[PDB]
Design a protein around this ligand. Sequence first.
Ligand SMILES: CCCCCCCCCCCC[N+](C)(C)[O-]
Ligand SMILES: CCCCCCCCCCCC[N+](C)(C)[O-]
Ligand SMILES: CCCCCCCCCCCC[N+](C)(C)[O-]
Ligand SMILES: CCCCCCCCCCCC[N+](C)(C)[O-]
Lengths: 598, 600
Amino acid sequence: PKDARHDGWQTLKRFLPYLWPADNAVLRRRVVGAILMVLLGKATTLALPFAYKKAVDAMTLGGGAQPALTVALAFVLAYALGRFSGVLFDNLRNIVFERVGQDATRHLAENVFARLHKLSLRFHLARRTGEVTKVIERGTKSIDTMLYFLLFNIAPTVIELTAVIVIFWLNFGLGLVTATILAVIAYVWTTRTITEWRTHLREKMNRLDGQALARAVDSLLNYETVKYFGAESREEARYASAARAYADAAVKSENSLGLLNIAQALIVNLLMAGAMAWTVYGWSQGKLTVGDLVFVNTYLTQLFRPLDMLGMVYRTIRQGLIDMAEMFRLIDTHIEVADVPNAPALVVNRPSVTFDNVVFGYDRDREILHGLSFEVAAGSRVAIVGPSGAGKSTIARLLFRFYDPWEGRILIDGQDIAHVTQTSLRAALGIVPQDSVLFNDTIGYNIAYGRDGASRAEVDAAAKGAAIADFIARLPQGYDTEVGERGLKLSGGEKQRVAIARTLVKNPPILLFDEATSALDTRTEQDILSTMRAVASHRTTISIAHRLSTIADSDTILVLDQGRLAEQGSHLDLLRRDGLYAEMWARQAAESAEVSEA
Amino acid sequence: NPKDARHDGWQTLKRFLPYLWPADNAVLRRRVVGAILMVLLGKATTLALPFAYKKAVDAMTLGGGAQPALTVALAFVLAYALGRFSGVLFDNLRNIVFERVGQDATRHLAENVFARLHKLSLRFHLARRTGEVTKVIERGTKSIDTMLYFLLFNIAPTVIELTAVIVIFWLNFGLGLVTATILAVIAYVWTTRTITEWRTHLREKMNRLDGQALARAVDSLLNYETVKYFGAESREEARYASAARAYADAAVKSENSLGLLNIAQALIVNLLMAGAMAWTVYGWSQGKLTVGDLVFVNTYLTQLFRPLDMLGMVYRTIRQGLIDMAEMFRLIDTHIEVADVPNAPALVVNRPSVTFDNVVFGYDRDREILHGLSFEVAAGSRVAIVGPSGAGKSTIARLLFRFYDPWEGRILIDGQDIAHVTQTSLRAALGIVPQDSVLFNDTIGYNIAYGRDGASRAEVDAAAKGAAIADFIARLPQGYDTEVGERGLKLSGGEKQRVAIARTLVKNPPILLFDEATSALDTRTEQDILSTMRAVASHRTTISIAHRLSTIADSDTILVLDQGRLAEQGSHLDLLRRDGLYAEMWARQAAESAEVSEAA
Ligand SMILES: CCCCCCCCCCCC[N+](C)(C)[O-]
Ligand SMILES: CCCCCCCCCCCC[N+](C)(C)[O-]
Ligand SMILES: CCCCCCCCCCCC[N+](C)(C)[O-]
Ligand SMILES: CCCCCCCCCCCC[N+](C)(C)[O-]
């Protein structure tokens, strides 16, 4: 299986089950029909030059003005009809297949998509919409072009080349056979080596093009700054030099194409010259008819027509195979966090949260949690705070099982979250993160996202609960207002309110505020804090906060130092202890005063 | 006037022709001539080579005058092969010789448009998304290049060949044959075109669906965390699958239609083939035509219809290329709102005063903002401009840099109306630190050096020091070669403002503008940067446009705008004493800060 040379062959064999699904009968029928269309089309194209030979033969055999007229007429008509017919077969093959190709590549994409969702968070799925989109577009085009070239250019040509070898064998040579085989070998090898050089030139040209283009775009998007420094002439010169570098590279790449074409023309035409000369010489001895010259000429031109594209085909087939290989590598990549076999669902009857001696870090060379233990009582409002090395920023990620502890365990109710299904676990958890994100869709879609079947009544109830309902009411399209971009832009407080609403639709027993107000301004922070307190009403709530004043009303506060629980208690008890929390409090207070000073 | 014509493809091409035939470069003109010669040689060769084929056949079937027939046939066969290779050689030599011409012409068109875009008014608001613009321009470049190549090296050679084939078929056959092939070409073109319009529409629908599917997938992947938080994986998968199926259906239709065009083309071509070959053989029956003639006619027809095998795509591309090119010329045509007057003198700043003289202005003609604004800023003085929401102060810097002209009134620097001087000299007199400074996609050292064209490493260092950003750059791994902006290291607002101060330091302008310079900063950052700003304001005329009055209270004088006019003028104390608009504002701002101080 995967235990193989890892070449184009393996990638292709891996793709083969998509083309021959074994789920779908209809597609299998289509593949068969397409193959029949290939065989018919080749049969037709091989046959039609014989029709040409006969017409010539009848006019040359050949004592004057004879029934040769009827026969020659019949044969030219057969030849023309054959030409049209082969085209009909080829286009019919394309048509019958296209559904197969489209389905197979779709299923491959869907499999990759699903896996990418199963894979680890640590794969840094935070990047540019444009860059990713360009890459995926490029690869999609790559794999498609590749499939079409492989199935409908290379394979028919292998069949035709073999048939021409058998035919040329039976009726000529075998000097003819060796000459054409050597010609094909030289043609392929030459095309290949020149193509490798050409692909390198293409890459350089492409990179230069990107550079000139980046210069123009950066310049234009910075029109104000360019005016401010009166730098138009400068930017023009800057663009122009880049544009010149690009043009030089383009001239080189395009010229190298002329070289490949000429090289190919020489090979084909030496073969033409030799084959036709030899055919004439055979005719001179009465061994071969005059029709034979036409026969050989047609056979060779037909053979070498698909190889006219060979260079491009090769580059393309190469690139696609690379890209597919890449696809499969992702499908192959192992999943860091998995449900154990036959994992039970989490059942939350009492929503306590326990951290039991948790040792964790993102990377094995940097340990963040050094044996963290704490208990959060069901229904309590708790805060987790600490200074810079405390490790509090891991809590949410550990709790939703984005990662597993190196050592120790996390429990909800009485249960190790490592031993339950990931879906049931996340089903018990609500989060309002620091930067909530909106999908590119309506406010309603975004709120409804909290639970799969969510009704509009539910969206309304949640929107009320987060107090974003009036704002939505004052939009013309209300809940059908598109947001994100290109959509309406929301303020930070508005987005946090959507996030809270989303969680309200989910309606979880355990709710996490993960630096929820950290990006908000003061007035916004104070406003959203009452909504948060209200929404915390009959849930176990864990608030992870930088600014202590925002969490002072907590039932209890857990203070972390150096990956362990340093202090615990209510805000007054902690101030009374004169410990780490008290110090932080003083410090934050002092800074608040300082800003007020100025 | 060439611009005085119907707006079609012909006009667009005629506009492009001077780029192809420069009358500046000459070398390129030679290349164009040479390329045309390669077209002619290549055509002569391809038209000639079937005759060599015809003759070879003739020597084999009427070997009476052509002997030794083996020798005659061989010589002709070799002639034919040599001819094939030769036509290919001419064609590629033509491409090679032209390619520099093409690249240069399109480069110049691009440079003309670029220069224009910089000349056009700010109101076209040229700040938008990099990815979209880049993909569009890439699309347009590919589009125009492809149409040029198809026009010069597919359509035109085919016209030459088609005419030649008509003259030849005329002299030596038919002329029923001439009519038949011409009818065939006409049917072929018409069928191809009508099918192509339909196909192009299907292509557009397909493409739009593809983008939609890709966007759903990308939104999901970039939102892996949120998708996780809500257990929404299956939902997102189904959501991708639905779009993906819509795309696949559209693609299937589009590719199927390709099969229809190909089949229609083959029907037309092959009917012609059948008729021509029948007519030729029957002509042979009557002793009119040689058997070589059959081969000759067949070869001629296949050669004629090979470049037309691409006709559909070709048609789609050339059309699009022409549209895109027209768009280019439209930009070049668009008139310039703000221009130097003819033979404009340089602005000469000896004493750097600034005068606003009865200035009436608005961005748009139905909304007037400045209603006759007048003020004098003394050379070397430090002044602030403040006002409430409708005062119009946000226009001042834009008027000074002549992004726009006053509707009425004028602006003077050192007694010279800025409308009548060269824009470059005027802008040379002015420094600005704007509210949001922007960085080029390049190193931080480049961004600082940008203040003056020839800026030395030393000047950059001095400016960085004056901006108090030198220490920060030192602690960068790559120092001045640290890449910044998008695709680069992210700088804080204060860091960006400090880079802007450094650029202005490199520039060393006589007059300096702080245009809401600290308005995007937090309080401490603002307080830090203000001392730097004051130091750099030392011996310049400085104009500070500020929302927050406390940040400008130490000004030599303060200009208070209300409703597009000068309401109040004077020192911060004179203004508090008057108990006027500035006083009210001051009081209110103080109140607000205290209220904010309250929440702690
Ligand atoms: C309809 C075609 C769907 C198949 C999936 C296409 C995704 C292409 C991504 C290829 C990128 C691989 N890589 C990283 C080497 O570029
Ligand atoms: C939105 C209007 C587009 C006009 C922009 C033209 C600026 C010149 C950039 C052309 C780039 C040429 N290229 C891609 C070959 O480098
Ligand atoms: C071959 C290089 C010539 C400059 C390339 C400029 C690209 C032009 C893109 C124009 C597209 C505008 N549009 C879609 C409205 O037609
Ligand atoms: C690291 C990049 C690999 C990501 C591949 C994701 C494949 C998602 C499917 C996108 C296919 C777009 N399509 C086929 C509709 O054009």
